[PDB]
Design a binder for this molecule. Structure first.
Ligand SMILES: [Zn+2]
Lengths: 143, 137, 49, 199, 70, 100, 183, 63, 67, 145
RNA sequence: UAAUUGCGAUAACGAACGAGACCUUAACCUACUAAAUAGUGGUGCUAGCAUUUGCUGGUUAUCCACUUCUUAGAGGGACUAUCGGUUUCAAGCCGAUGGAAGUUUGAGGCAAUAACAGGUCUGUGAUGCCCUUAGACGUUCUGGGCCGCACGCGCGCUACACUGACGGAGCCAGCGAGUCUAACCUUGGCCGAGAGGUCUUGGUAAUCUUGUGAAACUCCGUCGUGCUGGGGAUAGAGCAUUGUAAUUAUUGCUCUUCAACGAGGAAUUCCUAGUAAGCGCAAGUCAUCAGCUUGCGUUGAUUACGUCCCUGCCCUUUGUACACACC
């Protein structure tokens, strides 16, 4: 009864949309799996090779639907964490630009995302439709 | 009608209107504010007076300015004060009074904004009151 | 004759004492930290807190 | 009992709370009576509390700290070590997990058992270097019980399989049941060892 | 590592005769009562929470809260 | 009649207000239409420095502050009223800028 | 910009103050408005000095050609008195008494340095009422620090005046603590 | 361990070289017509109850 | 702390010595009367003077005081 | 996770690539035990071989272990990035290697000896046994026992 | 009492500077003034879901009004207010209530009569005397040096691990800084794994970076209790920018060894509530580099609400052959 992606907040929505992208079969993977750290400030790449890219795509789609158009730099800032710089104090280090750029380009290629006249990219009509359907299915499957 | 609430620096502005029992926090329902331990801290300004006790009021709040628990405190204060204002202006002054009594009998800075502000940090030492260390001898 | 000094303390100095140390390159001052403290209130910098 | 409903989806797990006797989210609060008459008004059960996060003014005056809920006293005591400084959310998660562990192992009204353990671990007499045997105020008894429980939990969860929640919960069980195999009770016994030799 | 790394079939009857003698089961309890090492204890308790006599109390992570069937 | 925006910046609050408030009456005496005076937040130019010219004594830092305050108004007036309102405002110490 | 623009205006004010104090000392300078103890040599020989100063200031600042009670004033006058020759203690006493009879509510002159070779002492002359310090010192006090360069050594002279709060004519007209009632 | 509970009826003042111990007159709940002075380190207010192993050992001021 | 100075106490005495048939034991009326008959040039000092005069008048109902 | 009785397919401490491997640790961190191979390199090579990451070298396979050895000794050919290896343009060849054996230490010794024999500042500091990477011995690394 | 703050006692009375008072700031103000350089609601530009219409919702020249949220001007409020008790008689203090806040409301700026052989001539085109002065101790250029290592000391970051590490995953700040004589903060696309470069674009600034999409932290999994997967100390190989110049690692990046550290002796520093501590942010130095400092904010305790045991200083008394005053 009038459900959006703002009725599953943080974990079940991601576990639902990543699984949906897995079942969809469309890969959109540029080959970065098992080769990249997902940021310059980490120590090791994600544990499971199958799933991290799809979860990245799920996160960026959900973020760009919950808020307005946002850019590769904004996603890099959001996904960049701290870094053990040695014996120096920890520091915020931005993520790998290429991975976020390629995830957004993959979303554009699928067509769920369009550009904005001011800069950045916003979720498309079909993208928002798919995300709302995913939310409704998540509510109807696991409360 | 409209109220605001703060704990340290986060301000939450809540609009309460005649609607159908819809209480939002940032677009998500009150079940998913997700501090994952203060999900009952946010429930408190509604569970206190009554189980639901309100299916005719709609509260939409938007919070920014502080941290996670600061914004939780800000929203739980703002929605309670919005409820107080709504009863003050429309429902009844008596009803406002008995719900203020319950709010003050469970007072958690729910109605009065906390005045604890970070004190300015002075030269010669990290922190406002702690000073650097000297051994000299 | 003269090697380039387009950067650094050979490039910048206090417009008053010509000191390369204590220079305040903030807000467009380009003036030393000691000349600043001496002739500060004449610039508009007051002591309030 | 009269399950009122509003528009937004919310479970009855919170909606069943205060129509009956006021209670915690999982554990009975009204069936809690301190086993002594000295520490009364130094614990802060009855009133009951929704969760141990009453972030209020409690250090302005001398005895305005004593009116803090005993669960939040426990959380604030776990709030130490510098590495665990801050992280009140973490500390309250451990405290909730300990409450669940006390429920599962010898439930015994877990908050009532915790207040009984604190009363039993409050050192009744100490010594001051003048060494003279002096008596302990009930506030000091409560504070030392909380601090000893926390430090024992820390020094037991150090270098072991058991997690901090599990070890603090088990130690609280020993303290409540009255065994001298617990670190807090053993330190209380050390403090009480100078009772005749320094009197 | 030092005991019961992956096998846990030297005493393979202890995968069933474990409910009694203690009302609580956890990742630490598995390492403590000479039964399971921590290299697979989480999934060994996952199996028992999926089907068995222990029922979980929450969606706990980094910890476990299980109680026997009433 | 043309539309203009008048901007006042200063450090002296007394003269800044003495100008921004007579502008309102100068407009009303000719019965003009204007958006109210807006106060863009005062910005402090606080800068910390070391008191002594050397390295002796306890580490004591003193800050100097320059508070800059500045307002803006929208007005609609002919060229004659525009030149009049920009000519009366020659108060020494407040910077006044008129854009069209 | 705006912050940079007004900072530039402030340093330009400091430049004007320093240059005018150094150059127009012989005319008895007090502060840039310009203000001199006598307003007649400001015009001089029907504008010659001021025209020369305008030309110099234009050349420096890249400008278009066509676009008694003061603490600093008395400090520089007494500097001139010491430099051209007068007893130092007598000069300080004369300055303080002159400021005192000129209506000022309090004066203090401190002279430090090598009067005669020693370990350099500080000789003071304080008369009337003085408050130091607080906010009211910025409110009503005029202070000046001056360096006297004689043939031997340098003397530091600090002159402080507590101007009469009654004859203020701007801002508060009495003391912050002054409480007076009528009956 | 003998157990007897009493209630403070008079706080005298601070005590000791460092000022950490405190003399308090305490009246026993049982046989209330008897007030003895005790040394306590933690804060004590009125109508508060102390527990003491020994009954009659008059703790005097600690200089 | 919360102790009053001479410039407040003696001024309050000077007001009350000639304005007893005057401002009552109410702090608001006392402070407004301070604005009325006293050219006190600070809100802080005005409030302090009003409070101390209020205390003096309140304690005068329990017996005359010195001075 | 599964029926792992493995009466005959469980391995204790084994032998692999000139270094004993502890059989009670997983494949990544047990391959990290060999001098020359670390955590992330082992993770990348194991995910390239597409073996299960959640099992240990004791029960993983017996032939894919030699496969992992082969891909480690031939990194550039068997799906490994050139930037992901420790040695490009070794001293004289310009092609990229990665010594994963009991030879990376030997390569380091040879680098040190040639850098010393070429009579460089780094070489003479290395011969003197002091810090060479600009580190300060005034107060730090003093005893070095 | 923070106070020579005040009460009181009293050959004193009445006073003055300093302290207070003053000002700055951080708290509040459903009160006034005004806001597409800020924010909120009613209408068309609203695509999704649900279809009796309701939730998120873009539309920055898309109209209207408003100022509750933000801003800043006049002003208001707190003055310890009321009530009990303690109070020499009072200054004050203690509890509760109200309060926006009751430890000077929190924190600072200013801060006297004076003294130091305290530091600075290595800031000053501040300066007495001397030196130097054309093989210069003036200026300037080339290289090093301040970094150096048998050793000792101090302020610090990382640290020694399951309240943890690693991955995703949730996305929350505040002080501010920024180029019109031009290369500053950089948004959005492009390339690159990364560093970094590329097309521009916005900002002379509440407009743009910037909502600083920060960390700490929450959630979910693995790691299993090990010198290990904490630590990246230690060196090598390669990858670029800053820099006319990275050799005597500026710095960042990927890989490679995971070394000491397994809780620290006698000792010893800072500190009483938004303070300790943990965490990060901005600014000064900057052509580039923080572990430094100056401000800022997020999470937010324990103990006590005092004493002279030590340490430091003040006062008083007291001795003096000191008065250049114990050098
Ligand atoms: Zn200078």
């Amino acid at each position: 009864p009038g459900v959006s992606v703002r009725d599953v907040a943080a974990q079940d929505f991601i576990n639902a949309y990543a699984s949906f992208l897995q079942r969809q079969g469309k890969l959109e993977v540029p080959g970065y799996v098992d080769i990249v750290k997902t940021s310059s400030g980490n120590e090791m790449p994600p544990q499971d090779a199958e799933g991290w890219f799809y979860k990245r795509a799920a996160s960026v789609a959900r973020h760009i639907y919950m808020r307005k158009q946002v850019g590769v730099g904004k996603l890099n800032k959001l996904y960049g964490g701290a870094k053990s710089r040695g014996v120096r104090p920890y520091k915020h280090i931005d993520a790998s630009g290429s991975i976020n750029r390629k995830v957004l380009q993959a979303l554009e290629k699928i067509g769920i995302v369009e550009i904005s006249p001011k800069g950045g990219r916003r979720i498309s009509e079909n993208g928002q439709r798919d995300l709302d359907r995913i939310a409704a299915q998540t509510l109807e499957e696991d409360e | 009608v409209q109220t605001f609430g703060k704990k340290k620096s986060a301000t939450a502005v809540a609009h309460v209107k005649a609607g159908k029992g819809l209480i939002k926090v940032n677009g998500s329902p009150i079940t998913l504010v997700e501090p994952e331990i203060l999900r009952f801290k946010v429930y408190e300004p509604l569970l206190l007076v009554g189980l639901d006790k309100f299916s005719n009021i709609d509260i939409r709040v938007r919070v920014t300015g502080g941290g996670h628990v600061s914004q939780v405190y800000a929203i739980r204060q703002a929605i309670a004060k919005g409820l107080v204002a709504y009863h003050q202006k429309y429902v009844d002054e008596q009803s406002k009074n008995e719900l203020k009594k319950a709010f003050t009998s469970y007072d958690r800075t729910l109605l009065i904004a906390d005045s604890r502000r970070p004190e300015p940090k002075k030269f010669g030492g990290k922190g406002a009151r702690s000073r650097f260390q000297k051994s000299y001898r | 004759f003269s090697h380039p000094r387009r950067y650094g303390k050979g490039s910048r100095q206090c417009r008053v004492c010509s000191s390369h140390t204590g220079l305040i390159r903030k807000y467009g001052l380009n003036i030393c930290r000691q000349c600043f403290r001496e002739k500060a209130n004449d610039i508009g910098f007051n002591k309030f807190r | 009992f009269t399950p009122v409903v509003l528009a937004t989806p919310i479970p009855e797990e919170v909606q069943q709370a205060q129509t009956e006797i006021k209670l915690f989210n999982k554990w009975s609060f009204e069936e809690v009576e301190v086993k002594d008459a000295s520490l009364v008004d130094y614990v802060q059960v009855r009133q009951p509390i929704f969760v141990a996060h009453t972030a209020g003014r409690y250090a302005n005056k001398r005895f305005r700290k004593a009116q803090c809920p005993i669960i939040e006293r426990l959380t604030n005591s776990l709030m130490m070590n510098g590495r665990n400084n801050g992280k009140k959310l973490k500390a309250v998660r451990i405290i909730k997990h300990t409450l669940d562990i006390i429920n599962v192992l010898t439930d015994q009204n877990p908050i009532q058992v915790v207040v009984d353990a604190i009363t039993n671990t409050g050192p009744r007499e100490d010594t001051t270097r003048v060494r003279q045997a002096v008596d302990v105020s009930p506030l000091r008894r409560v504070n030392q019980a909380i601090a000893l429980l926390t430090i024992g939990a820390r020094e037991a969860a150090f270098r072991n399989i058991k997690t901090i929640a599990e070890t603090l919960a088990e130690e609280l069980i020993n303290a409540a049941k009255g065994s001298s195999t617990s670190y807090a009770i053993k330190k209380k016994d050390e403090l009480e060892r100078v009772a005749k030799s320094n009197r | 590592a030092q005991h019961a790394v992956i096998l846990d079939q030297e005493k393979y009857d202890r995968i069933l005769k474990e409910v009694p003698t203690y009302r609580y089961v956890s990742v630490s309890v598995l390492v403590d009562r000479l039964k399971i090492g921590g290299s697979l204890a989480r999934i060994a308790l996952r199996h028992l929470e999926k089907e068995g006599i222990i029922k979980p109390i929450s969606k706990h992570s980094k910890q476990a809260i299980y109680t026997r069937a009433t | 009649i043309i539309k203009i925006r008048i901007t006042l910046t200063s450090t002296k609050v007394k003269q800044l207000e003495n100008v921004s408030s007579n502008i309102v009456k100068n407009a009303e005496q000719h019965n003009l239409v204007k958006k109210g005076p807006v106060r863009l937040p005062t910005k402090v130019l606080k800068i910390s420095t070391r008191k002594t010219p050397n390295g002796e004594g306890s580490k004591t830092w003193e800050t100097y502050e320059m508070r800059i305050h500045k307002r803006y108004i929208d007005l609609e007036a002919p060229v004659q009223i525009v030149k009049r309102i920009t000519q009366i405002t020659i108060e020494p110490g407040v910077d006044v800028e008129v854009v069209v | 910009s705006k912050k940079r623009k007004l900072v530039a205006d402030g340093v330009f004010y400091a430049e004007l103050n320093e240059f005018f104090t150094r150059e127009l000392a012989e005319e008895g300078y007090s502060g840039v408005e310009i203000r001199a103890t006598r307003t007649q040599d400001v015009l001089g020989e029907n504008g010659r000095r001021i025209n020369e100063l305008t030309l110099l200031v234009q050349k420096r600042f890249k400008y278009a050609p066509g676009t008694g009670l003061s603490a600093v004033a008395q400090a520089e006058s007494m500097k001139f008195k010491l430099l051209n020759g007068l007893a130092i203690r007598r000069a300080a006493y004369g300055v303080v008494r002159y400021v005192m009879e000129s209506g000022a509510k309090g004066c203090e002159v401190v002279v430090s340095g090598k009067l005669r070779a020693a370990r350099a002492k500080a000789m003071k002359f304080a008369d009337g009422f003085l408050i130091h310090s607080g906010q009211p010192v910025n409110d009503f006090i005029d202070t000046a620090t001056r360096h006297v360069l004689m043939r031997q050594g340098v003397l530091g002279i600090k002159v402080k005046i507590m101007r009469d709060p009654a004859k203020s004519r701007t801002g508060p007209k009495a003391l912050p603590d002054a409480v007076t009632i009528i009956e | 361990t003998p157990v007897t509970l009493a209630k403070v009826i008079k706080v005298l003042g601070r005590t000791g070289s460092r000022g950490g111990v405190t003399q308090v007159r305490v009246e026993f709940l049982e046989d209330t017509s008897r007030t003895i002075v005790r040394n306590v380190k933690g804060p004590v207010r009125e109508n508060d109850i102390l527990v003491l192993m020994e009954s009659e050992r008059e703790a005097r001021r600690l200089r | 702390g919360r102790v009053r100075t001479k410039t407040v106490k003696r001024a309050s005495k000077a007001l009350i010595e000639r304005y007893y048939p005057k401002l009552t034991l109410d702090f608001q009326t006392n402070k407004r009367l301070c604005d009325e008959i006293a050219t006190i040039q600070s809100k802080r000092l005005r409030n302090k003077i009003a409070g101390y005069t209020t205390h003096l008048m309140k304690r005068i109902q329990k017996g005359p005081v010195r001075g | 996770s599964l029926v792992v009785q493995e009466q005959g397919s469980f391995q204790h401490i084994l032998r692999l690539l000139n270094t004993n491997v502890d059989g009670n640790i997983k494949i990544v961190y047990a391959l990290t035990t060999i001098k020359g191979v670390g955590r992330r390199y082992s993770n990348l090579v194991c995910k390239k071989a597409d073996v299960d990451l959640h099992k240990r070298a004791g029960e993983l396979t017996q032939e894919e272990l030699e496969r992992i050895v082969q891909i480690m000794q031939n990194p550039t050919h068997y799906k490994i990035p050139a930037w992901f290896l420790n040695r490009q343009n070794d001293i004289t060849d310009g092609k990229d290697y990665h010594t994963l054996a009991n030879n990376v230490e030997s390569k380091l010794r040879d680098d040190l000896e040639r850098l010393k024999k070429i009579r460089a500042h780094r070489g003479i500091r290395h011969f003197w046994g002091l810090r060479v990477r600009g580190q300060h011995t005034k107060t730090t690394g003093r005893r070095r026992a």
